[PDB]
Symmetry: D2
Subunit: 317 residues, 4 copies
């Protein structure tokens, strides 16, 4: 039977005997994602160019506004906003959402794939909502995932039931379930990181990547791919297997990607698909945050590959 995101979350909710509030959140989020997709594919650009005589800000406003009006959220953390946004009392629900509304957009002038990353927590205390409600370890996530605006638009939704992938049919504005309960390969053949900054690599990263290009045995060297857009690179990692690295170094001892709305959601998707996500010292999902914009190193992907990285990493520690 055909299945849409709307029908899927309703049915997972009836199984869980839920009240429907998380489904309202996700419905509102999907509406925002269709609106972002439409703007990212440049619907209406002819009007900007005078036929009748910003993008990351618009994406942020869409997500912010749909979530606030969902009546399901109370604290909203965005990559685009210095402080957490506190939902006004009359619209407050029980969930905390951290999101990157248009990840990768700094290079959107070249039409690179971009995406929306999100992580959904249940508010844990009864105190007045504040930034501290978003300072939960990724282990506490209720749901997380991303929309990828690539050759097509796809929503990847990870929850306790696993990882499910929904293709946006723009003819009708429906997310169609096309990949159910997806699992990542145990071991891949692609490595993904910015090798231009090799001079700053931690010595363990240098050795691990050397082994991918120059295997000490008779295996074939890994292929290299690096889009420079986290959603594109992580989704390829999910589909094809392999490893994605944005690691710490001496100049950036905490990495550069942001824990709350980049690393944790991707780490959660990965673990629900049978993959791994490490900072090098611990699981990303076990980091207890102290700053809503704090950075974390991340190495994620096929478990055999992540474990091999950790072997080399331990060797230099």
């Amino acid at each position: 039977d055909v299945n849409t995101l709307t029908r899927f979350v309703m049915e997972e909710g009836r199984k869980a005997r839920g009240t429907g509030e998380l489904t309202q959140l996700l419905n509102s989020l999907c509406t925002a994602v269709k609106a972002i997709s439409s703007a990212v594919r440049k619907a209406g650009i002819a009007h900007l160019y005078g036929i009748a005589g910003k993008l990351d800000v618009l994406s942020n406003d869409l997500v912010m506004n749909m979530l606030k009006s969902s009546f399901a959220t109370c604290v909203l953390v965005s990559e685009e906003d210095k402080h957490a946004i506190i939902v006004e009392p009359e619209k407050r629900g029980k969930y905390v959402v951290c999101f990157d509304p248009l990840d990768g957009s700094s290079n959107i002038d070249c039409l690179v794939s971009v995406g929306t990353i999100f992580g959904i927590y249940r508010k844990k205390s009864t105190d007045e909502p504040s930034e501290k409600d978003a300072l939960q370890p990724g282990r506490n996530l209720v749901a997380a995932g991303y929309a990828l605006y690539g050759s097509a638009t796809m929503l990847v939704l990870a929850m306790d039931c696993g990882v499910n992938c929904f293709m946006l049919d723009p003819a009708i504005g429906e997310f169609i379930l096309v990949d159910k309960d997806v699992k990542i390969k145990k071991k891949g053949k692609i490595y993904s990181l910015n090798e231009g900054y090799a001079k700053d690599f931690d010595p363990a990263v240098t050795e691990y990547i050397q082994r991918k290009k120059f295997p000490p045995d008779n295996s074939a060297p890994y292929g290299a791919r690096y889009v420079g857009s986290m959603v594109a690179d992580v989704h390829r990692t999910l589909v094809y297997g392999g490893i994605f690295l944005y690691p710490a170094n001496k100049k950036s001892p905490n990495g550069k990607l942001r824990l709350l709305y980049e690393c944790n959601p991707m780490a959660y998707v990965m673990e629900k698909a049978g993959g791994m996500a490490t900072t090098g010292k611990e699981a990303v999902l076990d980091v207890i945050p102290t700053d809503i914009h704090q950075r974390a190193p991340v190495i994620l992907g096929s478990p055999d590959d992540v474990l091999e990285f950790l072997k080399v990493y331990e060797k230099h520690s």
Copy 2:
């Protein structure tokens, strides 16, 4: 004033006193590209999954083939998807030869990587009966070339004698809107792009060149690295931001991997019309004289300062 692809080529043709045949070709191609874009973004995918109770690269080929045949502007069509050249039936024969890659990069489309359509347009040069040999022209002979990139948005980049112009597809109205006129690439960039997974097979010149990007001998900042693995995406980034793109020969591909007629030549032509460069290492891509419609070529292309720097390293290794 607002300008569309349709209006633009018609006006360039009136300037040149043309008969309208190349405009008919380009109109037909743009119709195919909009249909390809629609299918690549998965419009109607719900019907495949049973809402009411062809593979993309095949459909893309059919769209380009059929639109070009019915344009009455072409006589020989070479496609990545077809082993032999397609000879247009006599009643629909026009004067142009088109080599194209209908959905470049589609082998990884299952991860939604950017994909694209690449095309190069020649005038048929011989008076012989149309045949595969009509497509064996060096890229220097191109009349027009370019690509559609199906990325975060769909864009058509069209290079001609007048320069390079970029048109954004507005899917609300099915129009390509002129958004970047007479585009020129930066003289020098800060990004290098190649599959470093083949580092073990690199010839010494490539190895040294890449070492210079990571460990600059003048202690300037290292280049950043980007490699989508989809040629249209990487070349378009190279055009927009500058830098250098490399697909050199390796042990799996001793004659390079990218295809001369419908990947390297069209991108080389766009690059040169934008003030960039494109070389095999031994000569300009556009100067290679093809002998086989699917033959491969090594390619190094992008900002002129960067390609020239590579060629100095190449000369150093003779």
Copy 3:
């Protein structure tokens, strides 16, 4: 604050402490309407004409399949099907749906407005579901409405809480609430019927139309509009006021429109909007059907206008 059909029905259901089954039905119905709208506006028609080298049937297939897979329905009556469709046991829910999947399509070759009409009943008996479960008076409706595929696509949904109008935004595939708790004008200035059958009119209709052209109280004559597509004519009646008539004639002594899936849904929308709908002898919603395809005369619209017709009708007994 912005509101979608998805969010609206979900929020009405949470207010009512519902189990979500009617929402699943209405969500499935909205998906089908968007796919019908896409096909009616001829998205993809270029493929039929060979770019790469039925409409009422498709609409019926879209509604049947989405409702079956909603797990909310048990009996389905369609204009297109001789007998009621009984949902297979594993997909059975508690609701009965009568619908006209593409009303007006007989004239779609001239691109007349067309529409989808639906009425939703709860199954009342514990017996195995059967065609007889749809033989309920319109008084028993739980929800009803229509999608109009006109200059734009609009879904009008009537329930106990009133009538709400949602515009389909085709850029994002969302029904946006644009008219809340709609009420029809007490009296309009437009009458709508096929005057081509004047030779067959009952004397009461003849006299009423005479009053519209030659007003006895010195008011201006009514304008006449008759699209010939019931959804288009009824929606204008809702928006501008006035009266719509499809009375009996010699070709159709019981009228021409079908009680279960044309007259009843429109009568229910009208009454929920403060309007009226009568056969001449009784309220449409009070007719107790004995055949799922039975016909009924219908006079509906602004209450002052219908009452004036009934005043003339009673004069002729």
Copy 4:
């Protein structure tokens, strides 16, 4: 073989050995029509209702047609239903054609989602004088091309030229007008009549008798059906496809009718005649009226030729 509006006009132009200027006009017009269609179907309406935290359609449509036509380099004088005076195209963008158009005909009732449309008629500038409003004061006989876009259940462009009438369906997935009906001809006699009978008390006696004949046929034939959308493009297009008659006639309160000659009556009369139909004011062919004011009204009775002739017989009978 598939044929699009753009491909069709290029090929008609190469046949005529034309310079392409009219094709540029028609291309620009098609771009505006696709943009009108998008706005009419309410693409983006969610932004008006606060999804992220504004011209009326008839204003937007006029702006779209005006701007696309000016930038076509193919026009010199532009007459719009929306503008009191003709627009004179600036010298650097002047071409040889005069365009009269109604950018969103029927829009006054668009709040009920009635079918609406865009109507256009294209003239060659005949004089060597400086371009002025007078260049639009040509009889419909002089039309080079005319037609309409109907935004109904689907969007269709009907284009009438010397070669006949052709119908192109807009495929909104790709923004292409696809040729679906070639060389269209109207039925010789129809079975539908179309006019606002609510104003019957003001009818001219010939109209009263003709409509009486449609409802109470004197020869035991079947009475005609009645249809009246109230949007001219929708009613005229149904008339083209199914046959019959459409009436917006003069009366004593409105001796010149209500519809506008230059950008409503003339283009529809031209489409009808190119399809083998008729269009009359009652006293003469619409296309033969010589206008003196760009916004002047004309009565119009059009459609299947036997039906129109029957009307004219009734009209002549009442002198």
